[model samples]
Target chain A: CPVSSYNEWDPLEEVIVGRAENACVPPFTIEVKANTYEKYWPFYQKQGGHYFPKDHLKKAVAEIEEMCNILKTEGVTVRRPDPIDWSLKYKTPDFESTGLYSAMPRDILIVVGNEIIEAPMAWRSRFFEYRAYRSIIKDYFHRGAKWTTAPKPTMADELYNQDYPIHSVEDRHKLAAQGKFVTTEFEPCFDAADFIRAGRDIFAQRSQVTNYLGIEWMRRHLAPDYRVHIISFKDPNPMHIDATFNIIGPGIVLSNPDRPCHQIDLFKKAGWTIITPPTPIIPDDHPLWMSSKWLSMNVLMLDEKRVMVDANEVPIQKMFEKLGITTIKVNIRNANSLGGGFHCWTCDVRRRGTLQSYLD
Target chain B: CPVSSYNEWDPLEEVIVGRAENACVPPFTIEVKANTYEKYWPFYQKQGGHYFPKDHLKKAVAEIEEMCNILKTEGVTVRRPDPIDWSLKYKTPDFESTGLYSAMPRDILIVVGNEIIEAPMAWRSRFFEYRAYRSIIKDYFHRGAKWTTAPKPTMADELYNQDYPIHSVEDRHKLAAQGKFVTTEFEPCFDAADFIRAGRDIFAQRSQVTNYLGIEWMRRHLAPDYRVHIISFKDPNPMHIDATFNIIGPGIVLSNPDRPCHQIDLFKKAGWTIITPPTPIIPDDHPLWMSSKWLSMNVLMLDEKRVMVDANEVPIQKMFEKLGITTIKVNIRNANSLGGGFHCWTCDVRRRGTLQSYLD
Candidate 1:
């Protein structure tokens, strides 16, 4: 089968790298406000439905191209998504909206074992983003792989909390504690980035983009074989779990110190080692339009002993080296403006490994 | 589980009966022309995006409501799709189309074991047909049933044979003999009605809306737990399998006399009994805009000993009686005009039976 992967740090064989071409700024809406940093509200309000800085996208494109080449040179296969004009507008019965970029494969797709599962995304703009990845997925499916798409939600008006609080950081924390999110239980929806895989146990979070029903849907679909556990954290803004609590290797996790997990005792009970990397060194003036500086710890694993770190993040590179793991640093600073690091911009399709319970 | 079924003859505990409220005539495209009768070409050309005759739909609605009542009276739970204005138009990156009605649940949904698999339809007009059923499916999924959507295909112009030989009847016969149809191998696509379940083995056909790749996708997705076998027929306008070869029970099927199965010998070798129903007695002037008179035999099995037979199709009803099956007579002639019989309009959800190998 051409598609097989269960965990994060197996020896990489095949991977799908995302595209940054024609990346559009999504329309500013209630759910968007609930997820984005308040600092970017003005930028989104002004630039909504338009392309991101073309020059920055060009740089990000070039960076990803070089990254793919580096991956190929390291004896791994690299697949790129079809570049699409994400600026096109589509109207469902419920709402009309333009699309966001296919710049984050991790946001919409997850490969568990031999199956490639497509997520039903929460954002109206991100709803149709799968158009750019279908060709590659079809190739994998035709090569004798199991392909499953979680129900493509209608993304109706009822799905969003139109009255979601965009007031204060403390409000989000209180809401998270009460299990309230920007998305309602009108239907199940999720971004694949909310779930971090570790062999037999996949960890999910009910973030602004992933609701409780969505996590339960994933849990039920993979039960009796793979267990899906919901884990939370202290962060006020929780959208994707990769930057919060990324499980890089078996029994080894890169937990962000800023957003310490509420259930740290589970790992502690399992004798797992939680590593907190130093703060990011990206300059303050370097625009991070969509994410926190914690993208420093949002690293990808080529294998259990080989780490792909940001070339400019010297502190984290030293941290990996100290842990006796080879750090293959590649710079994607411009790409970080799109809210993803190496781990977000790509989804590993095939890792040479077997399914084993790392949580036990 | 709210969604569990293996074969057609299991005692149906719950079923989904489709709505005929706002069915719109599909455009007279090449694929539509290839599948539909030439007599209805003018109707489609004129009423392409318009709703079915208002009075005709009213009658269909009443008949289906009566059918649902009958289903309920027979001790089977019934579900209905939410009504939608099928005249609403939507555009994808590839093409623009108005929606088709959710009047045939059998065409878009198939329940395999505990999973509800949604078909990736072939027609652009039928692309968003799933919207009407998502609510019921979400309810089932939340109640601990596996929900799966087959890769929602991009119904691009490339997916169809634009220059298909719609000029002659013999051309279609020759094409069918050579395993050809209006749909191209550009991608996998299928209407769920092209398949009929029979315990461990499910039968599929490469009809006008179903292609080899589509069958292959189904086979790959259901393997190791269930086996999907491709069956063929001698008919020219092969769109859905239920109307042509209705599997009323394990080891027994109602094979349409007009369209003999090319692989009848294989079933005969397996000791399967193929019953040939008498010719349908419906008037020739009756508008079967989407199908043939063979729908008389497209009976839904309430269980192995009970069948939902058309009240007007007395010949077939008597045939069921002769087979020691109690016939539940329900007339749905007006609904039939919208292109479905009892079996065509309803999807068996939960059946009181276990999955067993009926095939040697």
Candidate 2:
């Protein structure tokens, strides 16, 4: 891949969906395969099911081709060159006599930047690594400028605005001089030097890497001039890393209401409004981290006219529509199925920042 | 159970939990014989397991009494006098022979108006009945007012609130005239209405009731003063009847955003802002009724500093809290496990008319 020496790629650099407005690529896009033939039939046959004649196959293929043609005419890129064989992944023993199979397909098509490529099944196994990569890239491109220049933490500091809370000078000095400080839970600032210098410290051991690829991508694209913000949850999954944090306005970001502790003051210091969960609503029962279906968190955007969200956010999409936020949905099932989505797939290489200098 | 002179009695009026605020009922006092001692010994003996010698009986009775006394002193209504053997209810083929002889004692205590009563198992079943009763009361209260005072549907006449985009006047008139209108699937609103009505109808039928209990209950309680407004949906179950409709004020209501073919005209008639779904937000893969969980279809209000909610609203309670709504939960789990929550449980007894009427 060719790296951008300048460390940023404009949204306008590539057009994937609709005609580029101001040359920005449609907010997001992904490569998907439409079942062009009655592939399920052949798979079924291999597993002791009946077979389909060629006539049936021809009809199924024709229908898919027609659908693809319509999409292509409307400016959507179709990548279905052939039908998929998905039987190997999901066949039961009873169906062994026939040539049928049943399994979740491993191949997933991912669209990132100007390229459309298949994300190998092996990469999906390291779900968190890919998740972190996306998160870092998105944060840098969206809020890079602020991360580079922000006031140091102080005794009377406002923690919400600073792009990177741990990087405050006061915090660094406290760690350096005192060796350690036990900060209040939910407090936005903490000492960094103690974390780096002390060997048995908890803070240093807990530093996170969210969006490794996206973050590094943005960093390289923006070079030494680039700045970035990073936040990770105790449970560092893709939804929390990528979709949970959102930039609602120019500098304003909304953090997850569930855990607003350490980053509230950072955003406040960066001249950003930190939107907390609406009041009086208490957190109720949720399934364990492994199984909760509540939209505990997801990615979306706020523009002058509309909100762009992952297509699967059925419940919330209707809500925005009710609120008069025009909604744009991008199909992200494959990405989400692999444990990530739009925010997990894109990184912001450059973002406008406040003019104030932090070096003073 | 004494029959009241009136067609329906305010079940809350006589129940200790619903007594005058001044009545001092011990809170959360319920006690019963521990099944461990009561059933396990005999069960084990009968099943060829270890048997307690006759000498142990005295000690067992003495211990049980002492345990029982402590609960009574704590204001718990401990039931030990009329112990009925209910072991058969729990018996199954899998039980060992020892399980057959152990008689499981039944005991349940409840606070009832300044005193603790050992509530009979019969009353517990009746308590389950109250869930349905409350819902009937709420609906009847609102519908009765609407029928007697007969105020026009506040936002119904607006042109822009045309949820059934292709609806004709005949369709409106037909729906207006009857308590039930089976919506069509030609459009989104129609689908929503169909889904909601089917859920309510089937649920009510399974419960073996005719006419929604809420509607009838409101009629008896609120009398000629209240009104009922229903906005149905095309989505699946657990949706609120109010999802597509809202009583913005006493008489002012907002119907489905998809309704009122003319948005500007509906606002003019309702005399308030009309909210619509953001453009390009609709998804083909999902149904519109999924919006119920988005919190867009629900509302919360402040009652002093405490918060109250419509019953059974599990999925979106957090969303409401996000908006600052403090919640006081009522255990209607049994009710909701079968599908209706607080709103489904309670009906509006009265509402003000349109802006013009309220002003007058």
Candidate 3:
């Protein structure tokens, strides 16, 4: 029965941390192409279907191991996904590709109360990613935990707009404004990372991978008990919402300054405090193959007063300290190269909290 | 908004009828082997991945079409799945196979109030079977019906016991008693037909296809408002429950005499009428490749007063008449060869009824 987590800032109890072992580069599919930066297009083209740079992956493995050690040291039960060979090729009826990695548990698994949901992820490379976590999930189900998998999309040609315009950020912004995304409404598909929970109210966005139908599916599935609001941001290539609007504590969130939310007035009216973190200080030369420098804002809350953050992001650390929050920093700079900070790497399985309406 | 059905015997409004067009013989995999009769093992082995005899399929198509006409004549809105070529090869990350047909909408789709659930079938041939019904599902979703696809099984070698003993009915009985099914608990998998709905209460069974985890998933998903209770039967090779125990009206059911339910006393204690159906008169030479002769009991209820039944099941038709129920007879003898009766061929999507606890 250790699967109750309502919001982000509850006292940490149990968590499932992702593995970086045998991480492969996702084939440069249209969905993957849309999520990545334009600068890394050549790297993806050359390295597709292969393991990521061995040296960087080695470093990421070490850093995440150390991160697990830190979580244990802080009295939290840490669990890791079974290491899987991500280089193995998998072919679906619609498409064929090799897998990426179980490097981002947050992107696939989300716990809402006693139920743990496996997201029907959009990326073809991540199709069989759930296999890595099945062992852990089966254990949970054996011990009285509700397990759910959202309806997986066929991920066929019809699901993606092969002709989607991704020439420039401006084009993306225009396409996004018009409610266009790489994933068509062929079927409901989503990455759990697109949703950020806050007590009885959950906020989600229609990113490149998450479509309106996916949002609606979640909304209806968790209706009456949890209200899923479709909130939007100004970001052109929005995927995960954590970096954009991280609900760190009750009625408090870290809003990205660059991608201001269009629904900021709703939170403001609810007497919520929106904290805009300082600009990230990651050097421009550091290859963030999958994400922007906004990884600094994707901080994981251990509790209302404690946070797991990037050690290199000192400006954000100072921002947390100023707000009377203790920063237990760990550097995942190498892991960030694979796309995610602490929040993206781990999914909180059991948070010592109850469901409450923070917005009210 | 149109999808709502609390029980089987409600006044029928709308339903989805399955098509027999392009029906392919599923591969004689371990799970399929375990579910089929020994007499048909060679037939499955030889015909697997190929179309069922076209002449037989054509007859089935005509039978189902006439049945649909009867339904429309009875003032029910009938929806048919788009005709699909079921012989197309589909490969998943775990296994590759061609498809079974959309000849039984009851096997895939279930309507519970405003929500429609797509079952995660255990057969590899059925992994992509939902594709045939997506068009109809999307329309329901667009019209504000909640659509849910249960977590699909990977259909890997692990999901089935390749060493399953299918030598005789006695072996199946021994395995069933030991709670060992052809489908391993590798992941949650079930057919929608295994579950029979009653208002505020649903009954399910762990069959050759549905394991305990799949039943538990449904129980947890619909808790508080709806109670899902696991009921068991004495069938040797149990698959879908409708053929074995069909709930026909409020506090009334047609229990297959050949496979008596172990929990009959529970219904008896609640003053529920359990009528033992007459022995099916399907000839020994007839081919029931997928089901038992008990499909005679797999009758569909249009209302408490009217039941859709096989024209040939004169004994059961007389039984209904004795109970003051009208029989809307349609001959689907050829369709039954494809393995379903009235209830198994159609999924009741909208019945003019409200949620009520018949058991209580």
Candidate 4:
């Protein structure tokens, strides 16, 4: 999350444009990192090594590399972070950096104006604010050229005591008491009145923060098109993002139903296409998620009629098999540990679609 | 209520027969006084003398007489109790001499056996035994017949211990941790775990008792043809009674869903006629007495479409406006306080259906 008070350098606008319409096209290289990388990398340098097992670092690197390969194979240019740049930015004790914990391609390089705000670590918090923030970001894109002509006043980037507070991951023991922390662990069903009330509070907080900045900016300008989806769970701790929403080819989008009501309803009301099998309960003791956890709800659409999904999803497997969609799997246990799956760890910027005339 | 060791005397059967197919038959009458009428009649005793509320006595007599009149209008013969010799037969205060309580036309007056066994008035010290005794009584009705040729017991009468036994109605206040007497009020959604559990125990206990007597009495034998629908409240002093089985009219059979299974399945499995409207939840929040009172569940069928119900039902107005069934209301609030209703107050000896057919 870079803050450029002046319009001298804008990474956010450039990133959005690169992924919008047919502008940037495919093969645009991009890099993503876990939000935690920025927060704790300094600790590792001061201590001369990572606190966790070396295997964890190796595993993280391998997973990130695998994701880059997947992007490259999909005809998207991929790049690994230069070790020296990573060390200089991440291996410092006090050099504050925006941490990106999850796979958030759009935000890391959102194209908003002549300048692009490269938010490599803002992914963690940005994702939850995506639906609302995306709207405001898009508004910036629409008014980018106009903003460049009439340059806006610069604002101070100086951190304040209350506004820019210390950042630290929640202690594992106290996670349950904090619903936000729970969201990071697993999807939770919040049918109970108490949980629902707590969830509403979280929604309100996120809504306020996102709108305060994004919408405020938009009120002062026009925006572009952007959508956000938040996955919610019912288990005591239900914040894990298990799946992503993407249009396989045209008019066919795959996503999880267990997402928060605020996020789901937003997309549905917006007239976007959604496709999912039965809404599943956790633990997979339920028939829906039995056998293969990956196959149960994850499906990778190669095209509208062609896709890759968990081989274990009986209906999806059967349907795709009949439709001739080739399905494949990539081992990403590290992603699973982070409470995300294949779909959750990937983001699609653009895809081909049929024109109305061609369809007619 | 009279008790008999004979098991064949099923009071419900006698009521159905005495009431006839139209519920118009006059009920048999019986009046038990301490002394012979010749020795103490002609002139009334003083008002303060034992058994002296003359006007109250007349009202009681007239109330029963009116009930008899209604029964006679339905084309059934009424019988008066034959005088009995009580010369050398010792009497006790328990008899409440000089007072009169009569049986209906078809009521079968069985000897309560030669020995007199009084349930201890101090029920707390004896509550467990009393509960066991009640279970015994329920078993006698549910499964005792298969093992014995004696008439089924008509009913039992007992006064609450003024001293309040530990588990009895009176003793419960002291037994409660809060030391407060539970009210006698009614609530539709009262938690019935106690009653239902007691019912299940009765079913199981009856089976055991019958098996001990070498009877092939099965558990839940009456569940198909009948059930014990309970409408209790938070009120501690709850009125509980077993209403009769099938009535001639209203096509409505009184019963409760038991631990066994479906009400319809119970009936079908037991070779009983399945009525319409099915077994409903009895609709929560109906008028207090309409659905929450135990007597309300004790409706009597007057004909195939008519029914005699507790007159206090608030829904009687709406019921009459909707259904063409005849409704009869016999004021039993006083008697109900004594732990018996119309059905419990009188014992039936025969029914319209053949004994063989009824048994089948």
Taking chain A of candidate 3, what TM-score results?
0.99
lDDT of 4 by residue, A40-123 (tens): 345434432112233544564576566556545655433222121111123233222322222323323322223333221111
Against the hidden reference, what TM-scores do the models get?
0.51, 0.25, 0.51, 0.28
Given candidate 4, what's the lDDT at residue A280?
A: 30
lDDT of 1: 0.88
- As a whole number from 0 to 100, the lDDT of residue B132 in candidate 3 is 87
- The digit string of per-residue lDDT tens for model 2 on B168-252 reads 2344333423423222211111111111111001111100011233333323433343332233333222123344443333223
| DockQ scores for all predicted structures | 0.00, 0.01, 0.01, 0.01
lDDT values, one for every candidate: 0.88, 0.26, 0.88, 0.28
Residue-by-residue lDDT tens digits, candidate 4, B20-46: 100111111111111112222322222
Worst 10 residues of 4 chain A by lDDT: A191-200
Where does the lowest 10-residue lDDT sum fall in candidate 3 chain B? B265-274
**How much is B297 displaced in model 1, in angstroms?**
0.5
Clashing residue pairs, backbone N/CA/C < 3 A, model 3: none
Q: What is the two-chain DockQ of model 3?
A: 0.01
